[PDB]
Input
Amino acid sequence: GGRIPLWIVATVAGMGVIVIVGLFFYGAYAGLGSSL
Amino acid sequence: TITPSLKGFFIGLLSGAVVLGLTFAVLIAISQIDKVQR
Amino acid sequence: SYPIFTVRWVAVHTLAVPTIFFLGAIAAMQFIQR
Amino acid sequence: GLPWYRVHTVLINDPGRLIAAHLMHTALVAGWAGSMALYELATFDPSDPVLNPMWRQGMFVLPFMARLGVTGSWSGWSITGETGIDPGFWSFEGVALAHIVLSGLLFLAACWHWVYWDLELFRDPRTGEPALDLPKMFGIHLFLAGLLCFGFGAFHLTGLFGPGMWVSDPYGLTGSVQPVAPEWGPDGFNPYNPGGVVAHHIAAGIVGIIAGLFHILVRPPQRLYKALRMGNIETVLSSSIAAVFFAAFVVAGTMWYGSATTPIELFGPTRYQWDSSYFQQEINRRVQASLASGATLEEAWSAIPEKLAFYDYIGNNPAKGGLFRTGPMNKGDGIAQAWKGHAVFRNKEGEELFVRRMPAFFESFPVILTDKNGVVKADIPFRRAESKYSFEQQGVTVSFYGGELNGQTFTDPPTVKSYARKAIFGEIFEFDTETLNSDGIFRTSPRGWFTFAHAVFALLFFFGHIWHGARTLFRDVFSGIDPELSPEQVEWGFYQKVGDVTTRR
Amino acid sequence: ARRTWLGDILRPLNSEYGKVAPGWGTTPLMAVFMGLFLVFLLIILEIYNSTLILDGVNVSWKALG
Amino acid sequence: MEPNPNRQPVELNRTSLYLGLLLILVLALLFSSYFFN
Amino acid sequence: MEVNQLGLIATALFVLVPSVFLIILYVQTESQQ
Amino acid sequence: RGWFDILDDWLKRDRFVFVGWSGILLFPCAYLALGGWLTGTTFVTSWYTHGLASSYLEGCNFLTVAVSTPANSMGHSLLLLWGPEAQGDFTRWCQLGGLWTFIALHGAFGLIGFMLRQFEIARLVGVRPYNAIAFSAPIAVFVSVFLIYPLGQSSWFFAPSFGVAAIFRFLLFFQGFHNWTLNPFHMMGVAGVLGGALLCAIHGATVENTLFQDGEGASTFRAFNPTQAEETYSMVTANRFWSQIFGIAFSNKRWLHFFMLFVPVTGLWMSAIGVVGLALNLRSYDFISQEIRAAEDPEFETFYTKNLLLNEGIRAWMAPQDQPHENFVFPEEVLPRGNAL
Amino acid sequence: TTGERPFSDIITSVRYWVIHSITIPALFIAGWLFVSTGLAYDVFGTPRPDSYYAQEQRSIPLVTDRFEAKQQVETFLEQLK
Amino acid sequence: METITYVFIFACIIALFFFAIFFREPPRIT
Amino acid sequence: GTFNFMIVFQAEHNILMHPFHQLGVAGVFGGALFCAMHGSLVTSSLIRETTETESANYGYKFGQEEETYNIVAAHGYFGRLIFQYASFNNSRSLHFFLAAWPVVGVWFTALGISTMAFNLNGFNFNHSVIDAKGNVINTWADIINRANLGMEVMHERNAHNFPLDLA
Amino acid sequence: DWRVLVVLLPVLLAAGWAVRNILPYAVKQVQKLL
Ligand code: CLA
Ligand code: CLA
Ligand code: CLA
Ligand code: CLA
Ligand code: CLA
Ligand SMILES: CC(C)=CCC/C(C)=C/CC/C(C)=C/CC/C(C)=C/CC/C(C)=C/CC/C(C)=C/CC/C(C)=C/CC/C(C)=C/CC/C(C)=C/CC1=CC(=O)C(C)=C(C)C1=O
Ligand SMILES: CC1=C(/C=C/C(C)=C/C=C/C(C)=C/C=C/C=C(C)/C=C/C=C(C)/C=C/C2=C(C)CCCC2(C)C)C(C)(C)CCC1
Ligand SMILES: CC1=C(/C=C/C(C)=C/C=C/C(C)=C/C=C/C=C(C)/C=C/C=C(C)/C=C/C2=C(C)CCCC2(C)C)C(C)(C)CCC1
Ligand SMILES: CC1=C(/C=C/C(C)=C/C=C/C(C)=C/C=C/C=C(C)/C=C/C=C(C)/C=C/C2=C(C)CCCC2(C)C)C(C)(C)CCC1
Ligand code: OEX
Ligand SMILES: [Cl-]
Ligand SMILES: [Cl-]
Ligand SMILES: [Fe+2]
Output
């Protein structure tokens, strides 16, 4: 009902974006779109 | 006579009808089930 | 005593659902290579 | 006091002075038509409808008089080139005089209505209050509009009782005012069919008579009267403006793309006729037909009417102008005088070579010659040092067939380059540049100027629709919101249905 | 206010301010004509635009010959 | 016949004058070049 | 420069006519109070 | 108490997202114009219409991805999915640029929906509809740029493609081809946009630095109450400041906020007009008096003549790739080029 | 304030995360397979890295006709077969 | 005459500046 | 000359592809939008104090103690045009928002010009996309680059004796 | 073809999993609507 502290949802969620964006940035250097 | 593009016209015409009809069917229903008290 | 399914529910899921689908296809794309 | 931007609101509940202002506007508009026509007549040169038609001369209203059948001057000329005619009273000049007499009679009528504003006619007999029954007025005016739309189609356009309209062939060469029979089938909705214009007005004329009749006899539903504030003359202005901008977009587009009512002999060609080499295809069709039929080059080209070759020239493309380049097209490239002939380039091997034409987009364009296959074989180079396609190196020549230069060949590179530079404009003409002291820069056509104005005006009228529409629906708060609005009506959840206190919780 | 011969004649045409039919009236019918006129404008637009193509409707200058 | 009751006075204050003049003068100075071309 | 000669009448009227309008309405505003 | 009044009741209920009658036009179209863009920028190419790649799937990033316009060969075709060009083949539709018209038309009707929404919520709440009116300026920009411009032109191909870099390309098109910076309607738009940003920051900072001390804390936000009837800053001190710093200042709070509406709305309207001229290539490209002196007098140089050389470079160097359908071939020796570069 | 369930009470709620730790990753995987299987390439007609040009070719398959455009891109595509 | 026209308008704006500041309607309270 | 300056800057620095110029646009479009939004919303909620024949502006007297619009009513409208929580009910946060947004964005665009002075230029994706053979597959960035080139080669056409314009 | 079922399976289970987990509470809401 309010069992998860919200600060927790926010750090996991936040790290979740950080991960996926860093994927998208790693791929600018690898594979399609890298100039190589 | 009855050309391909005229066949297609009626396809588009009749599809727009479905979408509008179905859409307003749904909307009349919900307004009937969930009325405001008053 | 709230409802679960609302107009709101629908708008939210209209955007959320295909947002993740997309984020997964785009993820796969970083590994495509020529 | 009234702010400046609200002075004319004094007419809102004064039907007579409203009629007086409307009469004065009408008087000024008829006045303008008359004066524009007289200025045009004072400046029109009718001696050459081939290379100096009205549309090169900056004529704006002439072509609308010609479009409905006024083609002649009391001076004896007509715009078709016939000399010796006699148009009766309904000459260009007589049309102009009419509109001025009209302007003057309208001006007096306005004086009378401004002074005698307090006509019993305008008073509601029950309450004594100024009151206009707009629903019935709509049906009356609509019914008149249908009679006129009907009669105009039924009599003027047929030639039944009137002159017809301007028609022409697909290449604008033999236009004239002719009666037109209606086209009742599906091809009457083809914009390029003039019989559909006849059918339209007869058919819509009856619909407007019938609907007119409906709108005089049947009262509006209570639901609609309330929703559209039909006691409020500003609702009629809101919807009336919306209609006018709907119609201004349409006449803008048919002018730009072209229809049966924007003929190219009155308004000039379209840009699209240049995009698609429309006149060039047809010219080539004729030179090949002349030739298969055993004509020489000189003969096949000499067989080309100048009027047709003058269409095949970017100077008459309406999309080569500029916003502050003013006046007629003749002020720019000059007054056309003669066709010089069709120019033919051959390299030193004898390949025929083709100057690549300038596109409407480009103020400036390079000189590049190609073979029938698209392979570049010559150009005018910018950097000379590594140049390999110069006219000098390739030995490009120009020979002329038809026109003033027919049968002449030039070989000295500067002259050849000279015609190459004009060749990118299409067909090559000799211009008079002293007479108007022409500055050599392309102007647009009346086709261009009319589209521009009506597309702009229409957009601006969209905002007038929005302003006066808002003012009808929100008249009750024009001066401000209710000073005793309370945060319960505006806070959330207080009412199940927004703005409706009967749904409190 | 000023009476005039022509005013007395036109008098009944400006005589029914505020008169309405009850309730909804002819609105359902109006709506029909509206629906028709729209489809008819679609056809006209799509002919001009060349997404509707009809036999013997050659949408071009060449349709003046 | 009675004098017309719909007449109102018109007002333009001094700030509105200054604003209007500024508008016209700046407009004149933007377009003057295009009029001379 | 070889410039448009109506440029001058155009600019003058562009300036004068709206200006005189504003002035006329201002001065008669002051004459009331 | 009929079915219409029942449905009106349900549409107009107070909920997390109000719906209204306008929601019926707005929401389907706003959602589709947005799904169209996200769909095409992720998966769809520009190869056959443009010779360009334009999706994430193809290797483009967010700056280069775009839903591009149809090939110039389509003219102004509506490109309906079911129409003569794509014949109902969803795959061919995409490849012909059918998503361009989809986005632009549903977008156009969504914008109508939104302006009607502003009308509907303003009537139901009892405010004046000036927000709706102000939104007329966005609409006029949209319709003039994405609809009217290419309708005056040879085809949709020459409207803006929906994409970050693609719109950059469009800005440079208008410099090289239209010399749009010279155009007095763009300049008024520019004055309107910057005038607005200026008004935005200057009015926000003035309020925040003429605040009344209404609470004890260093954070001055806590001490406003949305129902207070008292002005929360001194209009009087703010007036004396700007009078003494700048010479003039506002005295009327209503004129001030109306001016904030007026300035940006007007500038956008002026630029819209200017683009309409450009639909027809009715440019403010040249000053004739300049060209006649420069032709005759090769020592006469101005920034005006300098920038038309730069436009000349832009046109020649970008035309072949930016308009593949014209098969332009400019041999090296014909490209305009200053010394060495 | 309008009777839906507050957002902050949903995403800390245990029943919420019970459903969503399945739905969110199932969707992220669905979208992956859409690319990894090559389907997205075929739904949309998007060229693969090996099918922009044909081996010795350097022309664009630019569409150039309005009513034959379908046929055009199809012809270009058989020139890769 | 072009030069003259441009300078006259500019000059006028500077004089309008002058009156707008020193000859404003003075703001007055409550 | 302003226009000359901004053309040459693009050929030499790809300022459009630079993020700090993108934020300046965001600041300057966003500023104009918020100027119109705030001006229309206050203007929409003026309390009635005048008649139909007068400027509502006369409803405010300089130095009056009361506020001249109803912000609760304005919140109530814009809240519903979007949703309740994307709209302000506190005037101080609202006016500080108006201040901060265009100021910050223009700090960045000024920093962009200041840092492209040391030739740290906008993103370059010229030929970033290639096929399996290794062909270039153009994007819109390459089109931009072509326009940029036309600027490069023409600007100050007589002033360069060597192949690179290094300043 | 077969790739389509691949893609579609996770969405279905996400539906079935959310379906079964929420079913009891979703029924009370429909009853409550009179
Ligand atoms: C007594 C009648 C009369 C006649 C015969 C003419 C005749 C002429 N006028 Mg004049 N004119 C008149 C009155 C008249 N005018 C008045 C009263 C005015 C003042 C407004 C003018 C102002 C005027 C101008 C400003 C100009 C002319 C011009 C012309 C010429 C071209 C007309 C043309 O193209 O119209 C074209 C007209 C139309 C396309 C109108 C169409 C009407 C639209 C579509 C509205 C439809 C709405 C309707 C209510 C809905 C109907 C419902 C339906 C179901 C029935 C022609 C010589 C032109 C000219 O050459 O001047 C020298 C010109 O530029 N006239
Ligand atoms: C729809 C209206 C219309 C149209 C399309 C035309 C079209 C034409 N006229 Mg005609 N004309 C009209 C109305 C019209 N006229 C009117 C009302 C008059 C009386 C004033 C005349 C008087 C007239 C004369 C005396 C002559 C023409 C001529 C011409 C031709 C070339 C004109 C030219 O170079 O324009 C140039 C246009 C421009 C430079 C564009 C000006 C637009 C300005 C900049 C807009 C103002 C902006 C505004 C102040 C911004 C502030 C807004 C913000 C603060 C809110 C062309 C065929 C000429 C011709 O060739 O005749 C043979 C000619 O000599 N016309
Ligand atoms: C048939 C067209 C039509 C008619 C009859 C009206 C009538 C009215 N309008 Mg609307 N309006 C229209 C079109 C129309 N409008 C359009 C197209 C727009 C968008 C531009 C507007 C925008 C508009 C606004 C924003 C406002 C009005 C207001 C009003 C009222 C007072 C106007 C006044 O005193 O002006 C006085 C104007 C002047 C003293 C000088 C104006 C000079 C202008 C700027 C240049 C003149 C151009 C020149 C004369 C040539 C004519 C133009 C050309 C189209 C022919 C009045 C009921 C006002 C209102 O609602 O008050 C309640 C108001 O605030 N209207
Ligand atoms: C409800 C809002 C809405 C609006 C305003 C639009 C508007 C549009 N859509 Mg979009 N669309 C919508 C919802 C909407 N759509 C939805 C919900 C979907 C998802 C299914 C789509 C999916 C979609 C696609 C896939 C495409 C469009 C396209 C279009 C455009 C062309 C439509 C057309 O020609 O209509 C023609 C049809 C009508 C105008 C309907 C008129 C209804 C008539 C009057 C009733 C006839 C009834 C019948 C004859 C009576 C019974 C007969 C008997 C047999 C029983 C247009 C901009 C096309 C586009 O963008 O092209 C680029 C396109 O390809 N739409
Ligand atoms: C000093 C710099 C400067 C400034 C301040 C401006 C200012 C302007 N320019 Mg100019 N420009 C400049 C330099 C500058 N320009 C230069 C140097 C060039 C090179 C020639 C250009 C080239 C140029 C072009 C080519 C055009 C402009 C246009 C404009 C106007 C755009 C108005 C607007 O907001 O449209 C933004 C768009 C809209 C307001 C449309 C509606 C937006 C809707 C509401 C979108 C809603 C979004 C939706 C919610 C979903 C999005 C979500 C998704 C992204 C995640 C504005 C007046 C345009 C113009 O004049 O328009 C008429 C135009 O086409 N400019
Ligand atoms: C010698 C010669 C010839 C010199 C040559 C010099 C030179 C080249 C000149 C060129 C001039 C030139 C032509 C310029 C043209 C400019 C141009 C493009 C014109 C724009 C025209 C136009 C109509 C555009 C349409 C858009 C338009 C309406 C924009 C208006 C912009 C505008 C005026 C915005 C306001 C600017 C601004 C600084 C406002 C100050 C406001 C101010 C006093 C706020 C202070 C303040 C804040 C508060 O918060 C409170 C509370 C109070 C109380 C308060 O007071
Ligand atoms: C009285 C009388 C008479 C006479 C009459 C007359 C003589 C008249 C005249 C009239 C006229 C003679 C008129 C005219 C008109 C004009 C007009 C009214 C105009 C307008 C204009 C405008 C409006 C414009 C605008 C503009 C400009 C200016 C610029 C550009 C843009 C524009 C277009 C906007 C008679 C004997 C018969 C009878 C008895 C009485
Ligand atoms: C009331 C109203 C109105 C008006 C309306 C109207 C005016 C109407 C009209 C209407 C109309 C007037 C209609 C029409 C229609 C038509 C149709 C719909 C037709 C169709 C056709 C077809 C589809 C055909 C087909 C074919 C072909 C083509 C060929 C072969 C054979 C066939 C047969 C198959 C308005 C808007 C103002 C608004 C308000 C209200
Ligand atoms: C087209 C079409 C359609 C439809 C479609 C749609 C409706 C779609 C949807 C779609 C969608 C609905 C999509 C979505 C997507 C999403 C995404 C893709 C997202 C992304 C995001 C991101 C990437 C972000 C990140 C970030 C950053 C960067 C920073 C800030 C923060 C954040 C974290 C946010 C249909 C069926 C009718 C058919 C026809 C066609
Ligand atoms: O001077 Mn002015 O602009 Ca900068 O880079 Mn090097 O330098 Mn010149 O060239 Mn590019
Ligand atoms: Cl330079
Ligand atoms: Cl150097
Ligand atoms: Fe404020």
Q: What stands out?
A: The first helix of chain K runs from residue 2 to 13.
